[PDB]
Amino acid sequence: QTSAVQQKLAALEKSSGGRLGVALIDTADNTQVLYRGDERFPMCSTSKVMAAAAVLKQSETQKQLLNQPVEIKPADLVNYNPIAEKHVNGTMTLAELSAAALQYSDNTAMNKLIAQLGGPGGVTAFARAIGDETFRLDRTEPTLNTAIPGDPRDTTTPRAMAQTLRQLTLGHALGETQRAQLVTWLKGNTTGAASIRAGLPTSWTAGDKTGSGDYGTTNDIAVIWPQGRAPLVLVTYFTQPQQNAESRRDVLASAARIIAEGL
Ligand SMILES: CCc1c(C)[nH]n(-c2nnn[nH]2)c1=O
Numbered sequence: 023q024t025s026a027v028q029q030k031l032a033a034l035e036k037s038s039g040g041r042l043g044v045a046l047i048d049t050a051d052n053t054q055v056l057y058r059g060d061e062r063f064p065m066c067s068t069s070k071v072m073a074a075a076a077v078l079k080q081s082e083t084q085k086q087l088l089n090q091p092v093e094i095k096p097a098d099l100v101n102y103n104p105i106a107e108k109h110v111n112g113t114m115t116l117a118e119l120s121a122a123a124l125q126y127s128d129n130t131a132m133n134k135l136i137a138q139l140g141g142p143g144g145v146t147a148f149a150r151a152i153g154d155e156t157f158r159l160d161r162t163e164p165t166l167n168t169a170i171p172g173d174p175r176d177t178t179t180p181r182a183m184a185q186t187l188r189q190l191t192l193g194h195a196l197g198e199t200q201r202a203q204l205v206t207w208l209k210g211n212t213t214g215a216a217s218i219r220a221g222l223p224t225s226w227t228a229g230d231k232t233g234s235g236d237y238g239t240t241n242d243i244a245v246i247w248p249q250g251r252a253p254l255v256l257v258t259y260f261t262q263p264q265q266n267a268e269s270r271r272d273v274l275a276s277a278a279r280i281i282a283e284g285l
Contacts, residue, residue: 027284031057031277038273040238040262045180046281047188050252055281059181063259064169066233067127068183068241069145069159069176073135074120074207075190076148078200080138081116088117092134099130101164106130124207124231129163136162149186152195156182167235169261180257183243188255191229191245205229208245216271217242218258221278225249238267242274248285256281 024032035042035057044057081087091113094106105122106114107130114122114131116138122131139145142159149157159166160175168175189195191205208229217232217240230244239261246254258274 025055027055027280028057030280030284034273034276034280038260038270040260040267040270040273042273042277043180043257043259044277044281045184045255045257047184047255048252048285049188049192049254054181054184055284056181057277060179062174062177062179063241063261064167064173064177064235064237064239065157065159065183065259066167066169066176066235066239066241067132068231068233068243069166070123070127070132070135070233071187071190071204071208071231071243072149072157072159073132073139073145074124075196075204076139076145077116077120077135078196078204079148079151082197082200088120089115091115092119092138094130094134098133100133101129103128103130121207121210125210125212127213127232132163142166152186152189154178154182154186157186167239169235169237169239171237171261171263180259184255184257187243187245187257192253192255205245214242214244217274218244218246218256218278220271220275221280222246222282223249226282232271234269236265238262238264238269240269240271240274242271244278248282251285254281 046055105128119131122128145159157178166176214230228246233241
């Protein structure tokens with residue numbers, strides 16, 4: 023069946039020029055709203071959540087892991103390094119790298135998290151360990167953002183990512199301390215005000231991780247605490263036919279607004 027919300031999302035998609043994927047989990051009743059929920063989309067920087075979570079999981083059996091230094095060399099810098107560039111020829115801890123990756127979308131920081139996990143496949147292995155059979159990380163930054171239509175590398179589905187984000191932030195995929203840390207990091211994101219959050223009532227609170235890449239790929243994944251409601255998990259993925267297409271964070275805001283008004 024096609025719901026009123028799905029019909030509205032289809033109209034938004036039609037006017038957008040691109041391809042839109044949405045998955046909502048409302049933890050008030052565990053119900054879901056999906057739009058292209060089982061189609062693959064390039065994750066781009068939203069994959070930073072899985073990498074940070076995997077390191078948090080490792081830290082459950084190593085009390086000092088988040089304080090472990092990682093050398094940052096000039097050669098390690100990639101295309102977007104707002105935090106790591108400050109610490110070149112020195113070190114950053116795994117906690118610092120996690121915060122930089124999540125809250126500033128630092129790509130050097132992401133690469134250090136991936137290396138700590140033994141490469142992209144280590145991130146995928148963690149996904150499988152927490153019940154996500156769909157997620158795949160194949161490459162490091164920046165090439166994981168090529169976002170080529172039809173390319174399965176570095177993709178997931180909206181349904182899978184919403185379920186995983188729920189398990190990580192609200193469920194028991196991580197220990198309590200680690201779950202709280204992940205939520206704290208997400209709630210301190212600096213990059214999200216124009217994306218999902220822009221479509222939500224101001225009274226609501228949220229944590230999120232944005233992503234963007236080639237083909238005008240514009241993504242956001244969020245955990246949301248609505249005023250007077252149980253939390254929501256919302257994934258919005260968007261990608262366009264031309265390699266050099268511009269970002270469309272407004273489309274994600276519009277999708278979130280449709281979802282919010284449909285509650
Ligand atoms: C490397 C610069 C960059 C890309 C390609 N995407 N992205 C981003 N968008 N939303 N969150 N991170 C960025 O900050």
